Design a protein around this nucleic acid. Structure first.
Lengths: 263, 206, 60, 77
RNA sequence: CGCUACUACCGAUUGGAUGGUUUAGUGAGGCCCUCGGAUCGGCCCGCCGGGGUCGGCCCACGGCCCUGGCGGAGCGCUGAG
RNA sequence: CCUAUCAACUUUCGAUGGUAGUCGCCGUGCCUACCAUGGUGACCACGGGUGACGGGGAAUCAGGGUUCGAUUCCGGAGAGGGAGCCUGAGAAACGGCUACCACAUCCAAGGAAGGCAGCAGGCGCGCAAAUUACCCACUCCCGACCCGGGGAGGUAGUGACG
RNA sequence: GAAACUGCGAAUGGCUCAUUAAAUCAGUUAUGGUUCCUUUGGUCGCUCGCUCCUCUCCUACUUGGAUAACUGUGGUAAUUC
């Protein structure tokens, strides 16, 4: 048996890149149902008390949430295990600090403060662009936000500045060659780079040849490429650890050099 | 209970499969509607995954469409003359999809004569006498000329249709499941298909 | 047996003990809805019409 | 179930029967009628098996099997 | 050829036991389906209490109508059962 | 995984396929009519056996290999055995139900209620395996919820597996 | 604010590996063959006037009537009766 879906998830069976411990706790937070899939999510708790360390109990975490000092995507949340994802902005209204989640090329979720100007909008790639019922068109973004009456020239894999004050499309950026991308998941996790060429194969799975800033060339599936804006025109800054790609030797040299040299 | 799986029965090799788990609610495979001809009752049923499925017990009206005029009228279905799934279905008068039924001629004919303002011919003596003549005369005083220009090659319709009007019932084919949909709706038989079904009706009898 | 006779106008109910066979027997083979006459039991239930409503057997 | 054994000796106790009835499955308990005023082991015993299969197997075999130069008699209790 | 001991074999007793398959018969229980009406009201025909109207503009009590109460008639006819 | 001292097998109670329908959350011989005579095997089928749950993993080996996997995690399966069902988006549910069967219990004899392969504990079994303890504070789960409940789980006790 | 009704959990959790030999299961694929509470995002006046019964269908300043908990009487050798 198995008479229905689990409402629990054990630790030491949760995805590595959330940066939880091994067996020292027997249960992981587990994301709630929401706009993103649970593998790629980062439960609010892990950000709040394991990275920003504002709680040393679970009792505190609930009490923090009930204050409602936390908006996520401009809207007022109170969920203890909110399923935030890629380019989801967290807005602390008590301190005026806006943090966004973007991958390190190490593969660890970055604590990446952004200005409240850049926390007005986020760039969301279209997943489907849908001729809906009664001939009204809609675009649907990756984060499951359906915006009606969208711009009437858009096509698949375009990005779309969604605004979080007022909802809706606030222009768009057209998908073209050489656009900035962050390649997410896989062995190419958290790398940034242009395009170069998108190879098309009829039937399932189309691969996109990416060249990164360093000049290392690799392919991944189209699914694993996320378009984050226009070529050589960032809209949010690079995170820690380069965010490009760095070798284990170089990384060791940074780790030893910076440590016992601060303070 | 009543069952529906792929983890039973014989293999390609001539082997025999041995069970995977014990019967579960999903496998349920409820007994037949067994809807026939008689006064309408339909029941709402709760089915798996939520949602509502209609179980018809007795039907006697359907919504039958005249596919060459693009109009559908609600008519009586009085009997099953032919069914190609099983002969027994006809005899028992059980309504299933693809039953060849008998619907009234009169609403389709009444619609055509009124609408095109000219009669097809004469269906019957009884039919003619109070109206049909009325339609022919027209209620247009005035706009008589408009009807004549508008309707060219009318005062008639196709040979197969006219022949069925004479009978006083039209053959029609059920295009929906009467037990799951709860609708015994269908399209009027026409051209080649009608000819073939009459051949089957004649072949089987005698 | 004990008859649990209620006057519902006053909202009252009481038990009474009747073990006299003739007084009882009147209410036998009645079904829950049927009227009966309660005249049998005495002067103080004379002119009374009683509607049987239920009750409990032995072994509850 | 429960099976009755009869034609026990006074040199045959619960312990002597305990090892005897193990090839017919494991006994749950062996009660043995004793009286110490006259003799030791009266002559009747009641062996209790846990499982119905094991109990029946015993009755079948042991009846005709020799133990301490006597033919043990076993039968359903 | 002989003492002693073990093992497989064959064995009367159509020995005994247990489990799984087997024809046929019987078949609990629920589910589906054709019925049934234990039961209760509602909407209509008496008296009233209010209102109203066509006893009555005294159109008011009341009849009558509506609705509440209560009984009875066809229990008529819808729904639940 | 082992087996030929298992070589032909699968449908008369469909075996494989065509066609059409019933039915099902939905595909489908799922089931049924009619119609075909298929489908599978020496490249081991079919049949029989199995302390036969599967994987990630574990132990030893120069390398090659050999052996292990119920057992802290993931999937599946069952909750005395069978069969049926209700609720609900999701259950054929034993800390739900109903029948029967095997087991056990109360009885005033008419009846009635039950399932530790949950946590402790006991009996039986054996060469073999611990407290009838304390707590929701941690870690998380559930709810109308910060607030409550948790033998989930934590905590001690037992503990020369190691 | 005990209670009770309502809604939700109770399918999850925990346990054990008996059962099953391409079955389970693993990895790789699919649903264009289908169902999905919830959460998250959209979707919330209208019969487009029955050529306005919806200006008369005039209950919108809002309709109808019953069970718990409760109160009282109780039954049962024994029931979360």
């Amino acid at each position: 048996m198995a008479r229905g879906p689990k409402k629990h998830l054990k630790r030491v069976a949760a995805p590595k890149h959330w940066m939880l411990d091994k067996l020292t706790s027997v249960f992981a937070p587990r994301p709630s149902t929401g706009p993103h899939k649970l593998r790629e999510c980062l439960p609010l708790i892990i950000f709040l008390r394991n990275k920003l360390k504002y709680a040393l109990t679970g009792d505190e975490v609930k009490k923090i949430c009930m204050q409602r000092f936390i908006k996520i995507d401009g809207k007022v949340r109170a969920d203890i295990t909110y399923p935030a994802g890629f380019m989801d902005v967290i807005s602390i209204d008590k301190t005026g600090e806006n943090f966004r989640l973007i991958y390190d090329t190490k593969g660890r979720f970055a604590v990446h403060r952004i200005t409240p100007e850049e926390a007005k909008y986020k760039l969301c790639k279209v997943r489907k662009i849908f001729v809906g019922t009664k001939g009204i068109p809609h675009l649907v973004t990756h984060d499951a936000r359906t915006i009606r009456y969208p711009d009437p020239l858009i096509k698949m894999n375009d990005t779309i500045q969604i605004d979080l004050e007022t909802g809706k499309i606030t222009d768009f950026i057209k998908f073209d060659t050489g656009n900035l991308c962050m390649v997410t998941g896989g062995a190419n996790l958290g790398r940034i780079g242009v395009i170069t060429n998108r190879e098309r194969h009829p039937g399932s799975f189309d691969v996109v040849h990416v060249k990164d800033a360093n000049g290392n060339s690799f392919a991944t599936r189209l699914s694993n490429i996320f378009v984050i804006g226009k070529g050589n025109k960032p809209w949010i800054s690079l995170p820690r650890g380069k965010g490009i790609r760095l070798t284990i030797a170089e990384e060791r040299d940074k780790r030893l050099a910076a440590k016992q040299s601060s303070g | 209970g009543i069952s529906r799986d792929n983890w039973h029965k014989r293999r390609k090799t001539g082997g025999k499969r041995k069970p995977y788990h014990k019967k579960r609610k999903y496998e349920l495979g409820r007994p037949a509607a067994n809807t026939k001809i008689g006064p309408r009752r339909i029941h709402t049923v709760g089915v798996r995954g939520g949602n509502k499925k209609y179980r018809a017990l007795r039907l006697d009206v359907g919504n039958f469409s005249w596919g060459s005029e693009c109009c559908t009228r609600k008519t009586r279905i009085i009997d099953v003359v032919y069914n190609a799934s099983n002969n027994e279905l006809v005899r028992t008068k059980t309504l299933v999809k693809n039953c060849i039924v008998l619907i009234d001629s009169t609403p389709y004919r009444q619609w055509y004569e009124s609408h095109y303002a000219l009669p097809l011919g004469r269906k019957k003596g009884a039919k003619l006498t109070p109206e049909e003549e009325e339609i022919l005369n027209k209620k247009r005083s005035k706009k008589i000329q408009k009807k004549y220009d508008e309707r060219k090659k009318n005062a008639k319709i196709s040979s197969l249709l006219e022949e069925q009007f004479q009978q006083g019932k039209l053959l029609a084919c059920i295009a929906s499941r009467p037990g799951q949909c709860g609708r015994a709706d269908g399209y009027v038989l026409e051209g080649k298909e009608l000819e073939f079904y009459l051949r089957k009706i004649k072949a089987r009898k005698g | 047996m004990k008859l649990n006779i209620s006057f519902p106008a006053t909202g009252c109910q009481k038990l009474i003990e009747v073990d006299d066979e003739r007084k009882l027997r009147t209410f036998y083979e009645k079904r829950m809805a049927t009227e009966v006459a309660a005249d049998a039991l005495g002067e103080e239930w004379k002119g009374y019409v009683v509607r049987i409503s239920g009750g409990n057997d032995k072994q509850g | 179930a429960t099976i009755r054994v009869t034609n026990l000796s006074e040199d045959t106790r619960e312990t002597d029967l305990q090892e005897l009835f193990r090839p017919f499955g494991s006994i749950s308990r062996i009660y043995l009628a004793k009286d110490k005023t006259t003799g030791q082991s009266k002559g009747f015993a009641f062996i209790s098996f846990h499982r119905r299969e094991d109990a029946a197997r015993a009755i079948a075999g042991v009846s005709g099997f020799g133990y301490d130069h006597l033919i043990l008699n076993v039968e359903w209790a």
